[PDB]
């Protein structure tokens, strides 16, 4: 069950109670389709049925050759603001799968696979480098061509096919056509992976025989729609009468640990005169999951997809942070973990729809309200950073933008605090910090207070030094703070 805590002090909330499906790795499978290799159609009848069959044949031919052009080029793909994204690492998503694709070209590797599938589809092949992979043959097109159309390639008259065969071949061959089309516009790498690349029945019957937990098996096969989006299909080869491509599939190595989504919104002062305001916003936005005694961190909402209570994320775009980061939802000033924040001068009305509610930052004359579908507006917001639960609320309107709130259920707790923007002195408070921490702001402050300390102590230190005596052509002596004339004493 999902709960949410809002922190009035840090203009942030946390959505707690989720579960983590974490993509930790890959498993590469080899999908294949058997293809009769036919360069020459010699049948001279003319009967519309023969004609249509020949048309589909040419479609198949051009499909093959298209795919060969695809095979020559080695496949590749490519897969900030108030977010910490810029801190992320950089990785090669399909690197694994591509290594397998290479291994397939190796002379005689194909034949290992063709010889593994004699007595049944879906079987294990170990490759020359001893990386073992599932291989599944999802289409036998060569068989149908043989058992069905063989008159039309090698005979001239060439007995006439019945129209049922025409329909059937169009049906069968279509899959190859679509797989080819996809690989064409996508330069040989597709994600998510199609129903044409793997049928639900095929992908489940793959998952089932992968080397993983029954909890993992159960987890993918419940979530197939997600599994697809985290998978790739890589065009590999077409040779020796088999088209073969690798589908690299996500290995979830961290299942059912706690996860929470941290939400952030502009904090800011209420000073009635404009431009005189100082403003502070936490930059630790996004997903957090317990992983292996640490906490992982997904700064980018694109990395994470939310099915009900499970949060599927990709560790590839993530950082792994020591657990003490959970502090800043309580003591943002706690020194054991230094929390990251941006600072600036620009007070602009913003709002952020959270899991169980909505944060609202209302600054200036902007009108901020929350309304119910029946009762109309049920709350008007003052200037500041506030929050409202999803219970009894439907819409949150801020300025001219009308936000709808998620209606999924859970308990929501408002946690009062004094807005930490108030603890800062406007004069020494830097707004030039784009990417910053709490202590780095403390540091630019300690320097801009320091040069006040030094300049004031220097100005007071020349107090204790004596001015010039008069220029009047008399000699002067020092007596209790002043100059006196020497004449006084003689």
């Amino acid at each position: 069950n999902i709960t949410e805590e809002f922190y009035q002090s840090t203009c942030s909330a946390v959505s707690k109670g989720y579960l983590s499906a974490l993509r930790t790795g890959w498993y590469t499978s080899v999908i294949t389709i058997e293809l009769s290799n036919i360069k020459k159609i010699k049948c001279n009848g003319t009967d519309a049925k023969i004609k249509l069959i020949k048309q589909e044949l040419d479609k198949y031919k051009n499909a093959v050759t298209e795919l060969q052009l695809l095979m020559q080029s080695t496949p590749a793909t490519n897969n900030s603001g108030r977010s910490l994204g810029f801190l992320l690492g950089v990785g090669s998503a399909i690197a694994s799968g591509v290594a397998v694709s290479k291994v397939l070209h190796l002379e005689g590797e194909v034949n290992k696979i063709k010889s593994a599938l004699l007595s049944t589809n879906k079987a294990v092949v170990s490759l020359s480098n001893g990386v073992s992979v599932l291989t599944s043959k999802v289409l036998d097109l060569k068989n149908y061509i043989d058992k069905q159309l063989l008159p039309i390639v090698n005979k001239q008259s060439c007995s006439i096919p019945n129209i049922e065969t025409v329909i059937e071949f169009q049906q069968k061959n279509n899959r190859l056509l679509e797989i080819t089309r996809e690989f064409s516009v996508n330069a040989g790498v597709t994600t998510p992976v199609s129903t044409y690349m793997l049928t639900n029945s095929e992908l489940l019957s793959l998952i089932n025989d992968m080397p993983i937990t029954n909890d993992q098996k159960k987890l993918m096969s419940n979530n197939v729609q997600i599994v697809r989006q985290q998978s790739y299909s890589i065009m590999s080869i077409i040779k020796e009468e088999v088209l073969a491509y690798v589908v690299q599939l996500p290995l979830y190595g961290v299942i059912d640990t706690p996860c929470w989504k941290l939400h952030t919104s502009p904090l800011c002062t209420t000073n009635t005169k404009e431009g005189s305001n100082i403003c502070l916003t936490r930059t630790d936005r996004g997903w957090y999951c317990d992983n292996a005694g640490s906490v992982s961190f997904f700064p980018q909402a694109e990395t994470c997809k939310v099915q009900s209570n499970r949060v599927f994320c990709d560790t590839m775009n993530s950082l792994t942070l020591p657990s003490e980061v959970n502090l800043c939802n309580v003591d943002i000033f706690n020194p054991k973990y230094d929390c990251k924040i941006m600072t600036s001068k620009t007070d602009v009305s913003s709002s952020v729809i959270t899991s169980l509610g909505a944060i609202v930052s209302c600054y200036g004359k902007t009108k901020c309200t929350a309304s119910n579908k029946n009762r109309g507006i049920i709350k008007t917001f003052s200037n500041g950073c506030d929050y409202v639960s999803n219970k009894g609320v439907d819409t949150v309107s801020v300025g001219n933008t009308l936000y709808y709130v998620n209606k999924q259920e859970g308990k929501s707790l408002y946690v009062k605090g004094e807005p930490i923007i108030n603890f800062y002195d406007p004069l020494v408070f830097p707004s030039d910090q784009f990417d910053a921490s709490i202590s780095q702001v403390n540091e630019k402050i300690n320097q801009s207070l320091a040069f006040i300390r030094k300049s004031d102590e220097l100005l007071s230190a020349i107090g204790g030094y004596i001015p010039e005596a008069p220029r009047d052509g008399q000699a002067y002596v020092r007596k209790d703070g002043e100059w006196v004339l020497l004449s006084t004493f003689l």
Partner: antibody, heavy 124, light 108 residues
């Protein structure tokens, strides 16, 4: 649906014998077929097999270049040939259909159809 | 070739009792595996295939697990005509191999 082995007998060592299998009651071409032998009071040994068009055929390491397996598909027949027949080849020889059709819409697996099997004894 | 290792040698279980037979495989056979029953003096009957799915005709006493190196055949309540020899086979690669077999003898 029947597989009927024929041509086992009593054969002297080092000499040759031919076994045939006639097929009945199912469309023969569509299936790939294996010869599987069983020594007396012993286990099952896969001898060899062919598949739908003598496209791929394969042998046990035990019988290699000694044995040869071809099919007609016309006579709806299967043939295994036994040369330099050694004395441990004696066994009941089974014609066995492989239920995995490759490319029909519903797949089956395993070895579903077995003859009574002939009986080949290599002794002097 | 990968070696099916049948086990136990023999198994003795009294009529109407669960019996369990085991098949280890040299390298991983995944699931492509089958179980055969052979009553003395006749051919194999095919019991299970895909390790998990009983062939048409087989009663629901016979049940199997699998997809790995280690595998299981389970007969729910042994009945008169179930005392026979059982063989496992994988079809993952050629050559098709088998185990040695497990005799189930009626226990006295």
């Amino acid at each position: 649906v029947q597989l009927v082995e024929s041509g086992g007998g009593l054969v002297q060592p080092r000499r040759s014998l031919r076994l045939s299998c006639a097929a009945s009651g199912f469309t023969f071409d569509d299936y790939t077929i294996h010869w599987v032998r069983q020594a007396p009071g012993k286990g099952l040994e896969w001898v060899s097999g062919i598949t739908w068009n003598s496209g791929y055929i394969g042998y046990a390491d035990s019988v290699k270049g000694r044995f040869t397996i071809s099919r007609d598909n016309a006579r709806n027949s299967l043939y295994l040939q036994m040369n330099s027949l050694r004395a441990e080849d004696t066994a009941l020889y089974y014609c066995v259909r492989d239920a995995y059709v490759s490319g029909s819409d519903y797949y089956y697996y395993g070895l579903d159809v077995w003859g009574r099997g002939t009986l080949v004894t290599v002794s002097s | 070739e990968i070696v099916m290792t049948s086990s136990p040698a023999t198994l003795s279980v009294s009529p109407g009792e669960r019996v369990t037979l085991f098949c280890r495989a040299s390298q991983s056979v995944i699931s492509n595996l089958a179980w055969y029953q052979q009553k003395s003096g006749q051919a194999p009957r095919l019991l299970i295939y895909g390790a998990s799915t009983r062939a048409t005709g087989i009663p629901s006493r016979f049940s199997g697990s699998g997809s790995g190196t280690e595998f299981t055949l389970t007969i729910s309540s042994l009945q008169s005509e179930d005392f026979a020899v059982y063989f496992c086979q994988q079809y993952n690669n050629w050559p098709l191999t088998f185990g040695g077999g497990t005799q189930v003898n009626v226990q006295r």
